[PDB]
């Protein structure tokens, strides 16, 4: 039963067990080779366990099937973590749909590129518009941008 497998994936993900979620997702992918949600979860599992190149290889092996349901955030995130900042920037700017996750990464990418004026505008917006457990951290990031300008 593939609904039963998905129930397993969800349970593991909610408990942060991406190692076991990956095993179950791979069983789903044996049944439905082009399930976009399964490929998306596989990418997340790999990123969560530090396997950024493996996650990127999944994305780039399934480009057509993932097109426009796509994981531009995850692809750019892996590129960012793999010291490919220029790739990461292009992936973000090429995304079909802009999201809060993409904007968060975009601020970090602009910081790494030393584009501090644009970075500051992004972080001011991120600080204002975000409601999450990371306001203190995000304001620390904003202060690092202000410091770099001076």
């Amino acid at each position: 039963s593939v609904p039963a497998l998905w129930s397993e994936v969800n349970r593991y993900g909610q408990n942060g067990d991406f190692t076991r979620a990956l095993k179950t997702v791979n069983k789903i992918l044996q049944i439905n080779k082009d399930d976009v949600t399964a490929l998306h979860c596989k990418v997340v599992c790999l990123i969560q366990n530090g396997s950024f190149k493996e996650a990127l290889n999944v994305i780039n092996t399934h480009t057509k099937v993932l097109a426009n349901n796509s994981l531009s955030f995850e692809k750019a995130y892996c590129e960012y973590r793999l010291n490919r900042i220029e790739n990461a920037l292009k992936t973000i700017e090429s995304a079909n749909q802009q999201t809060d996750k993409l904007k968060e990464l975009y601020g970090q990418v602009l910081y790494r590129l030393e584009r501090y004026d644009e970075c500051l505008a992004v972080y001011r917006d991120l600080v204002r518009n975000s409601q999450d457990d990371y306001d203190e951290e995000r304001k620390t990031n904003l202060s690092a941008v202000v410091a770099a300008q001076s």
Binding site: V2, P3, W6, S7, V9, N10, G13, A21, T37, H40, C41, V44, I47, Q48, F73, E74, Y77, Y80, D100, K101, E104, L105, Q108, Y111, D132, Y134, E137, R138, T140, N141, S143, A144, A147, A148
Partner: peptide
């Protein structure tokens, strides 16, 4: 290097899975 947090990592999460049930 000032302290700078990778907050993007906190966004790395499964999509909603209800429909897969």
């Amino acid at each position: 290097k000032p302290l700078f947090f990778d907050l993007a990592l906190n966004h790395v999460a499964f999509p909603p899975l209800e429909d897969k049930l």
